[PDB]
Design a protein around this ligand. Sequence first.
Ligand SMILES: O=c1ccn([C@H]2C[C@H](O)[C@@H](COP(=O)(O)O)O2)c(=O)[nH]1
Ligand SMILES: O=c1ccn([C@H]2C[C@H](O)[C@@H](COP(=O)(O)O)O2)c(=O)[nH]1
Lengths: 279, 283
Amino acid sequence: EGEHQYLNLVREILERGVKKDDRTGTGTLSIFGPQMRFSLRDDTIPVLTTKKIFWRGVVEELLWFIRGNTDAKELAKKKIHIWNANGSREFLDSRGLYDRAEGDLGPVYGFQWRHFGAEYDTCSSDYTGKGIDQLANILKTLRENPDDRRMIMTAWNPMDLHLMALPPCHMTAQFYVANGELSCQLYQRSGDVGLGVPFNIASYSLLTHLMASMVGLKPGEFILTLGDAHIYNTHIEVLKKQLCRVPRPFPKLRILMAPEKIEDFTIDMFYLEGYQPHS
Amino acid sequence: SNAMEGEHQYLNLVREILERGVKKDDRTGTGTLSIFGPQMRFSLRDDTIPVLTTKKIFWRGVVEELLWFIRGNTDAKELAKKKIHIWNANGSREFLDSRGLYDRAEGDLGPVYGFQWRHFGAEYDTCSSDYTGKGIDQLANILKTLRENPDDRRMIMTAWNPMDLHLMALPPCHMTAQFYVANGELSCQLYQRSGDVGLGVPFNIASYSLLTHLMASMVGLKPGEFILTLGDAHIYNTHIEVLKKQLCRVPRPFPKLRILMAPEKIEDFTIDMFYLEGYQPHS
Ligand SMILES: O=c1ccn([C@H]2C[C@H](O)[C@@H](COP(=O)(O)O)O2)c(=O)[nH]1
Ligand SMILES: O=c1ccn([C@H]2C[C@H](O)[C@@H](COP(=O)(O)O)O2)c(=O)[nH]1
């Protein structure tokens, strides 16, 4: 049912979610363990049509993850300011990272993907050949042994959590191949269904399409498995309004080229075709 | 996944892989029927524990393997002493040599499951080594969080340590678990990257459901649900006919777990402290 899976999850949380408080104390409606499956066949990419998704933000954040970058200032340079708050002096101080420079998020997401286990210094440091390159290893495995049942990429490193501005949310992904098609399952421990989740869906779906082009496979499915899937009490009314919007068909991703190395992908190499969101 | 489908979810999953699974080769290439991403949900309410009734589950094996994980133990010889021989093959001289672990003593599985639960990040020496206060005790940290901040969305326990994989006899299967609390009920979701639906999966279901029941008793919570999320869910070509025969079996109601006491520390639980009530499997 495509987008209707997302909209039915919103509906389910509104109707059956339990009243649960978050870190600050801000209330949520919550359910545990829901799953959503999106077809990536016929170039489809699940970018929501009932709300306009910040596609440029999705792309730049992903490429920044793929490069193994952790400097929020590098995103701020591209006019993507989604990570600036968690890289602020006041926020880093609140986490006990007083020595850490402004915008230096620590060994978050991408650093774990490309350099798992490497000793973190700063965001500007040279990490070439440091730690375990999980992403490069998955790409080599998809080319040489696509039936492998261990194609895991994790950002969940218990030893580095204290060094991160925030612990990973979209924490573990698994890759799978069947009938020349690449599928991805993301385990996400916590999901703000109203804000973060639509962005995570577009992000990992883009990652799967990009990875498929790297290894001569076709995109299959993207599965999002959530832990605590919740709606903030402040979002209920705006989400109720979004539920009345009739979805339009999902856009198609057009990849113009794939470079030799996945970290050399630029926003110019691919684009959304027929993206018609509600205004 | 729907909680009150009980054992029918499992029988529907077997039927699903049988009818819709793709022909996929494994490590050796023995052949499987495979599907990606299926989920099962089991209610642990009213003391229910999802131990399959369409096939007899080795309950004593489930229990002793779990307690051995909870203790952070990795010596297959310690399991063998309890007449549980399920890990003996992967601890054998021939198998350890096949993994390039020639220096490794027989039965020493390396930093597998339980060692990661209790000592994530600790430097592994042998199975007999003293690891008291070494590495990150994920299980003890989850238990403290369940007592102090049950709404926490970071109660993760992982065995997936990329740096230790080469030291293990086998990479972790049941790799990451998340805990959750709502209305005084404890739920567990397990992410399992690979599942042999015919053999390992029924055992993993009973194992993590037992762990949830045990953890709840430790922290004054009631068991809620156990969610199993699979990556590659498969059936080996050699099991197709035996599984088709199991599909003709009508499930009986699930047994109930009776916990007599909970010790101060979870690693001090013994098989004598709890038992299965009304377990009626097909013979
Ligand atoms: O990619 C992300 C990152 C964060 N969040 C949301 C989930 C929670 O509402 C919040 C993080 O809070 P904790 O789960 O860490 O408490 O941000 C997402 O939805 N997606
Ligand atoms: O707790 C476990 C451990 C293993 N397996 C099965 C899954 C696979 O059939 C096999 C392990 O093989 P790989 O996924 O590592 O290739 O054992 C399970 O079902 N459950």
